[PDB]
Each structure stands twice: as C-alpha cells, then as structure tokens.
Amino acid sequence: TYDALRRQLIPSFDLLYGSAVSVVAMSVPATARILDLGAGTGLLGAALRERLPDAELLLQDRSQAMLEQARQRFADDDQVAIRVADHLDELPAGPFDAVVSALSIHHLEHQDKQDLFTRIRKILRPGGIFVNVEQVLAPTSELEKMYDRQHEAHVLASDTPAEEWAAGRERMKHDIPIDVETQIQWLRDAGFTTADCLAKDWRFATYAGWNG
Ligand SMILES: C[S@@+](CC[C@H](N)C(=O)[O-])C[C@H]1O[C@@H](n2cnc3c(N)ncnc32)[C@H](O)[C@@H]1O
Ligand SMILES: [Ca+2]
C-alpha cells in the first residue's frame, strides 16, 4: 500500500526490505528471473528493480486491486509481468533464480506454508534463493506481549494515524504467524540445503533458503 504508511506500520522497513534485496543481489546474476509472491502494490519488486535493473520480475497476487497499483508503479517497465494467482494455485513453471515474498505467507495455514516452501523449491534453479520478509510470532505468549509492545512503540513514534493503526489491528486478527526458527526449519524440511535469519526487529524478520 502507500509507501509512507507501510514504513509507519513496519519497524526496520529499510533493514528488512534492504536485507532481502542485498541477499538476492549477492546470490543471483544481474539478469535473474525473480517471482514476487503476494507482490501487493509491488514494494519488494520495486526495491529489487532499483538494485537489479536487468532482472526479469513476475509479480503474483490473488488481488487484482493490489496488482492495479503494481501495474501503475511499473507502467513503463518492459521487464515486469503480472500474474493473478493464489499462493495455493499452481506456481508459474519458471525456472526462477529467486522467489521472494513480503508480509503475505503468514496469511496461510501452517500446513499450506510447509507445502508452499516445497512447491517454491521445485520452481527454483539449483543454488536458487527463496527470501521472506515476514511477520513472525514470538516463541512464547509472554515474549509475544513484548513483541506487541515493541511493534506499537514503532507505530506511535512514527506518528501513525490512529484510524490506520486500528485498521492494522483489525487486519492482523486473521494473521497465522509462527516463530522464525520454526519457519527456517520448514525450509530445511522442504529440501533447502542452507537457511538463515539475515535480519530481525522483534515481530518482523528477513530469512532465506538456498536450493543448493
Ligand atoms: C500486507 S500485503 C504485502 C504486499 C507486498 N508484498 C508488500 O510487501 O508491501 C499482503 C499481500 O498478500 C496477498 N495475499 C494474501 N493471501 C494471499 C494468498 N493466499 N494468495 C495470494 N496472495 C495473497 C494480499 O492480497 C496482499 O497483496
Ligand atoms: Ca497480515
């Protein structure tokens, strides 16, 4: 959604999205084929294009309304394609050098996350990278309260409109997050040979898996 609001709602936006861009740029060639899963308005795709002008981007989302904003953002870009599809629909064949996602996969049931990670590995080239900029759960209810306080601290310090934070709270009611270490293990289960948490700010983390 509108870029200024996203930075108000998401702690360490530049660290987390920047880490995603950096790990892709160090993992794949300038001419990488990249799938952005749950691309929304295309914020992560845009961050990648800024660093990788010659990359082929496929932006995928279930929402035509969200992808309309991505289409406007990439109106003049000859190396961007749009696919309307659910995460649970058949993935595009590729192959891809990188599959990336931001703040989307935490909307799936856990079993669907585990299956998705396996399906993603099948469309990745050998040595290909999967990167997730993700909303994560604390490993305990007591730490989850602390995560929540730290998230709210960022939102308030960012002078976020009360109505946008209240709307944010409402959207978060149907989140299905899990801790970062569990999700990283699910990458290993899916057959990624290396997986790591690159950057983290309490509730928000950038992690990656390599296919070889
Ligand atoms: C909070 S937005 C993140 C958008 C963008 N990736 C970003 O970083 O700003 C979550 C996105 O995931 C999409 N989404 C949620 N569940 C999905 C699903 N099951 N299949 C496909 N897209 C989904 C939503 O339509 C929305 O565009
Ligand atoms: Ca969410």
User: What is the three-class DSSP state of 35?
Assistant: strand
CA distance 95 to 98: 9
Query: How many angstroms separate the Cα of 60 from the Cα of each of 109, 144, 190?
Result: 19, 31, 21
CA proximity to 37, closest of 95, 105, 125, 90: 105
Residue located via tokens 């899990």: 178
Is any atom of ligand 1 closer than 6 Å to the C-beta of 34? no
Six token digits for residue 141: 């209810």
- Of 1, 2, 9, residue with least CA distance to 160: 9
Q: CB neighbours (10 Å) of residue 159?
A: 7
Query: How many Å apart are CA 201 and CA 120, to the nearest integer?
Result: 26
Q: Residue 101 forms beta bridges with which residues?
A: 37, 132
For residue 63, the surrounding DSSP H or E stretch is none
Are 34 and 59 contacting, i.e. CB atoms less than 8 angstroms apart? no
DSSP state of 89: S
Ligand 1 atom closest to the CA of 63, numbered from 1: 25
Which token pair is 63?
């929402």
Is the separation of the CB atoms in 6 and 195 below 8 Å? no
Q: Find all residues with CB under 8 Å of 31, minimum gap 6, and list them.
A: 54, 55, 56
Question: Are 57 and 36 a contacting pair, CB within 8 Å?
Answer: yes
User: Mutual orientation of helices 110-123 and 180-189 as an angle, nearest 10°?
Assistant: 50
Tokens of 181: 């270490």
**Ligand 1 touching residue 107 (CB < 6 A):** yes
CB 44 within 8 A of CB 57: no
Q: Which atom of ligand 1 is nearest to the CA of 36?
A: 6
Q: Which residue CA neighbors atom 27 of ligand 1 most closely?
A: 40
Residue whose token pair is 């970062």: 180
Structure determination method: X-ray
Closest C-alpha residue for ligand 1 atom 1: 103
Q: Residue with the nearest Cα to atom 26 of ligand 1?
A: 40
Residue 119 near residue 192, CB atoms below 8 Å: no
Helix (H, G, I), strand (E, B) or coil at 140: coil
Q: Which parts of the chain fold into alpha helices (H)?
A: 3-9, 13-25, 43-51, 64-73, 110-123, 141-157, 162-171, 180-189
Ligand 1 centroid to residue 59 C-alpha, Å = 11
For the sheet containing 33-37, what is the strand order?
80-84, 56-61, 33-37, 96-102, 124-135, 204-210, 194-201
- Give residue 171 CA to ligand 2 midpoint distance, Å: 6
17 is in an annotated binding site: yes
Q: Name residue, tokens 């870009």.
A: 77
* Beta pairing class for 194-201 and 204-210: antiparallel
Write the burial class of residue 63 (CB in 10 Å: 0-12 exposed, 13-18 middle, 19+ buried): middle
Alpha-carbon distance of 105 to 91, in angstroms, equals: 14
Query: Cα separation of 20 and 12, whole Å?
Result: 12
Q: Using the 8-state DSSP alphabet, how is residue 175 labeled? A: -
Q: Which two tokens stand for residue 2?
A: 């509108």
Pairing mode, strands 204-210 and 124-135:
antiparallel
The three-class DSSP label of residue 131 is: strand
Distance 29 CA to ligand 2 centre (A): 31
| 198 CA to centre of ligand 2 in angstroms | 21
106 is in an annotated binding site: yes
Q: Binding residue per annotation — 189?
A: no
CATH fold of 3-210: Rossmann fold (3.40.50)
Give the residue from 134, 125, 127 showing the smallest Cα distance to 186.
134
Contact 198, 5 (CB under 8 A): no
